[PDB]
Amino acid sequence: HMLNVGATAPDFTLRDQNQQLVTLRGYRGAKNVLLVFFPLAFTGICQGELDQLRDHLPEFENDDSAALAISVGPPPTHKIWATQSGFTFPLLSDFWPHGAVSQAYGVFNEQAGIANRGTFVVDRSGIIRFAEMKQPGEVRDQRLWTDALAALTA
Amino acid sequence: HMLNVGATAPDFTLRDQNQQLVTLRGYRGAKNVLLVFFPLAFTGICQGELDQLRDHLPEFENDDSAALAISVGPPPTHKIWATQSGFTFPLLSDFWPHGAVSQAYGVFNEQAGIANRGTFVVDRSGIIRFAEMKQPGEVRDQRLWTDALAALT
């Protein structure tokens, strides 16, 4: 099942949309990390969620916080989507092995082969301090994300 | 790994870019099928190959022949690419299980998690009658596809 608050966040090294390696442990001791798992690029609900993250980026990518969007797509998919959508934050490929990081966080839909709408905040110690999992057909409330992030600055 | 000529073509049922199910077996007795495997949507060499196919579509999609392009990408990826590129032929998703059909045809790159640039012609009996895979630099020779197809009518 989904990892809950108090668990150590599984570490990972994934390619971003520009093929650079991004590792979760690299933020430890420096920033709180918002992990935004999403099902599929070029779909309507995903578009809306990541458009909203784009529109409010300074709340998620600053001196205290970092945001990483994760899905099973490979980098060329995430690159074209990011370019066409104006996304400048990292989109990470859980592509091969397929959904392995999703599976480690307990947010992989084993029937569909896609991550659910899982969201986590990982504190500077690497412990999960916010956890949620919505289904692909549901929409998340991003005020919950900013509120969790805010509580780990002060 | 690649299946050679004379082998029975593994049957599949995959979603196309509009989420419709396409099954190889449905062409048996009716059409020769060209199977164009490709690594990734939105890449350069894939683009050029499938653009050639678009530009020559009546040679590949007619009363005697059908063409199916196959990669590991899911339908929304294929839908956006297809729409942007004018691909009106089926792009099929070997997505989940990841590359299972590609594996069955012996054209899966296990290290990278993508299909290689393999091509097959399947006759009206379901037998592989043409099998092609080019070097990493090299774009496939589509006159060859139309020649193989032409030999089977």
Numbering used by the authors:
A (entry chain B): 0 to 153
B (entry chain A): 0 to 152
Question: How does the study describe this entry?
Answer:
We assessed the performance of these methods in the identification of sulfur hydrogen bonds within the active site of the enzyme Alkyl hydroperoxide reductase E (AhpE) from Mycobacterium tuberculosis. To test our approach on structural coordinated atoms in space, we used the active site environment of the peroxidatic sulfur of peroxiredoxin AhpE, a single cysteine enzyme. AhpE reduces H2O2 to water but no H2O2 is present in the active site of the AhpE structures. It is predicted that stabilization of the Cys45 thiolate by Arg116 will promote its nucleophilic character, so that this Cys represents a catalytically active state of the enzyme.
Accordingly, we decided to use both chains in our analysis, because the cysteine environment in each is distinctly different. In chain A, the side chain of the conserved arginine residue (Arg116) is oriented away from the cysteine and directed outwards to the flexible β9-α5 loop, whilst in chain B it is turned inwards to the active site cysteine. To improve protein stability during MD simulations, we realized that a re-refinement of the models of the AhpE structure was needed (see supplementary). After this re-refinement operation, we repeated the simulation with the newly refined structure for chain A and found that after 30 ns the helix α2 remained intact. In chain A with Cys45 modeled as a thiolate, the sulfur has four direct H-bonds, while in chain B five H-bonds were found. In the case of chain A, however, the H-bonding network is much more dependent on water molecules, which, in their mobility, provide a less stable H-bonding environment. Beyond that, our results confirm that chain B, where the conserved Arg116 is located in the surroundings of Cys45 active site, is the reactive conformation for H2O2 reduction.
